[PDB]
């Protein structure tokens, strides 16, 4: 049926073993790629950089090339899927999160849940210094017809000047197979920008996305 | 107080999307490094190899060397700790593992949730051909006064003689300090061996456990 | 100060402790970032897939957007550059190198060592199951003036239909800082695509390539 | 077929694009594992830390337990070996090596070939603030008859506290198939210490190794 058209999302989980909380809805334009997404604290103030939550805070919003369904759209009321990322940071943090989702006619509900642990008191994360995230190119391959394998060097710019470095790897398995035609077309990528604004408590998040599999 | 005799799981998540949730008891020697653990299926038989679900399945029942508290059994009475493990399989899958405790006088009770992904259909572990897990050497150091950062090489071997390899880290979180003189010997390292009797459905458990700072 | 039209490379070193050297000579169009070279081996056959020695087998070609100069291009005639660069496959083995060039007016040769080890003997490499390398992007970042630090994960296509995958960094080092308005420009990233024929003994060997910072 | 009793090293290569180059000797006791090493700079001081240049700094000199060979001694007079190594540091640094070696008796020559880049200007190591290597366990595993794959965690302490850290690979790779008994005792592990006392100039290295595969 239709593409989405809009979300709401409550994420929870734990860094370096404090427990956070948070929910909103959002919107977006599954033709255009964009999505935006509002998220207010349950648990009182975040004791982390609000950042670190990107790339984790919807793909079904993401359309392959000449406005084809992403196997992430065509999934929605076929079979559905699950997404299990992974972050590893270079000062030794590591961030793993679950992804899970309910549909309602062209409405998502996520419920994401992660763990991330290892950020050093003094490093960019537990200071509030991540300033924004660097525009970003996604690699995928389907190693077979039902999995995505997904990669990207993620990388934030900071107070100090200094970028903040992790390898993001995610898998994506879905409940029924890709369609062939997209499974014969790798790797495709995808390239994003992202936009965040936080307080201790709240955060308006924008995305948007486009597919390629060559440029012009 | 105590050091722990004796100890429970539940254990639970999926793997390639499929969940599992296992449960049960077993027993061990804290002064030894010494257990072992009965576990049986709540949803059927196992559609992975029961062997991915080492080293995942108490480092409480370790000791440091000459009799010395580990900061695992010390944590046990005062603040105690959360783990955070990952798993990087040489062939794209990985398993990230969320570990929390409630200690009733000796007794531990152990909930673990657990997110394996991409792992390969004809891959050693959803063909259940992993054979046995290779002794191994953990290395922990200490980057801060609450916080263990260990790391292994953890390898199986399989049925077709190929071992199969991944990277493992382990994020260890603490609510109260380690004492100052747990933090001034590192790095520690613990020599472990493990032994797996499984079927579809249950899982007998055995490990071996000694912590040292150099060799005879 | 002319751009590259021409190239030579002389590229030796050992794969899972076979020594093999290569040499022959290319050309392209520094701006539109192609280039073309032809290898022949003075060691006889070679003992593994010569589709490892790409991407090993020269960023001078590449302009950056708009017609603007590379940091590999200006550093040409203004200080020169190395690089650096390691391979992690999936199946334990590893291929790092060293890249040095030297100028003659429009004209490179590069000399370049390499050292792969651990390849499985029946893997494809040395099974030489290789069939083409997937179409990349590079993603370039500069960490201080003389540096860029840039990472691709590169994938072979292989006769089994299984992909061979590595993690792959390449770090470069300029003798002479980098143009401002280049280090302001973060991340760059490269688009690339290769060809490549080959015999026991020759390579020939295609290169598109194309900066972008955004599509 | 003698053990090592004495060794001399020609090691060179570039650091962030400057080159080095240091020569010395040594010994040390093949059936105890320890060896000692002195080298000296042929190109003036050194632009970095020379605790990066340990470990690749000789297995020959490390027994097997129980007084047997290990496969570096009894590949010495029998094939011999080569080593590929890599160590990926946290903060996005690399340094690879080639090792070599020719035998004459009792005595080894090293020359090892090394590739460092992307040290940060004001890591520890370009800052020259590294201060001791931390004791290390090294596990081996022999992927098939000639091949050793080894993994370590390697950490430094540093003058400020925070320990810098490295994943490090090495690959091994010998002329001639490892005798049938060691291939069955796997993971091997080494347990080794060192010390290093440097000048810009000079340095004075030491080892101490132990092959265990169980406590």
Redesign the interface.
């Known amino acids: 049926s239709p593409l989405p058209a809009t979300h709401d999302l409550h994420i929870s989980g734990?860094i370096?073993?404090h427990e956070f909380d948070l929910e909103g809805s959002g919107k977006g334009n599954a033709k255009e790629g964009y999505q935006e997404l509002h998220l207010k604290s349950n648990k009182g103030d975040l004791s982390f950089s609000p950042w670190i939550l990107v790339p984790n805070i919807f793909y079904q919003y993401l359309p392959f090339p000449d406005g084809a369904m992403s196997p992430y759209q065509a999934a929605m009321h076929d079979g559905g899927y699950?997404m299990?990322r992974?972050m590893?940071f270079?000062?030794?943090?590591?961030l793993?999160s679950?992804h899970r989702y309910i549909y309602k006619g062209n409405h998502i509900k996520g419920e994401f849940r992660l763990?991330?642990?290892?950020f050093?008191?003094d490093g960019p994360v537990m200071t509030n210094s991540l300033t924004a995230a660097?525009?970003c190119?996604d690699?995928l391959?389907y190693?077979?017809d039902n999995?995505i394998?997904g990669?990207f060097?993620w990388?934030y710019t900071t107070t100090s000047g200094?970028?903040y470095?992790s390898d993001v790897?995610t898998?994506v398995?879905?409940?029924k197979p890709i369609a062939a035609d997209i499974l014969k077309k790798?790797?495709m990528?995808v390239?994003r920008?992202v936009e965040l604004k936080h307080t201790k408590t709240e955060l308006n998040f924008k995305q948007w996305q486009?597919a390629?599999?060559?440029?012009?």
Chains 1, 2 share one sequence.
Do not use: C, Y
Not at 90 to 94: C, K, L, N, R, T
Not at 115 to 118: A, E, I, M
Not at 212 to 216: K, P, T, Y
């Open positions: 734990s370096n073993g699950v299990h992974s590893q270079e000062d030794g943090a590591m793993h679950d763990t991330g642990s290892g050093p008191a660097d525009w190119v690699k391959l190693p077979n999995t394998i990669k060097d990388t200094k970028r470095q790897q898998n398995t879905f409940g790798q790797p990528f390239f920008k486009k390629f599999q060559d440029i012009a």
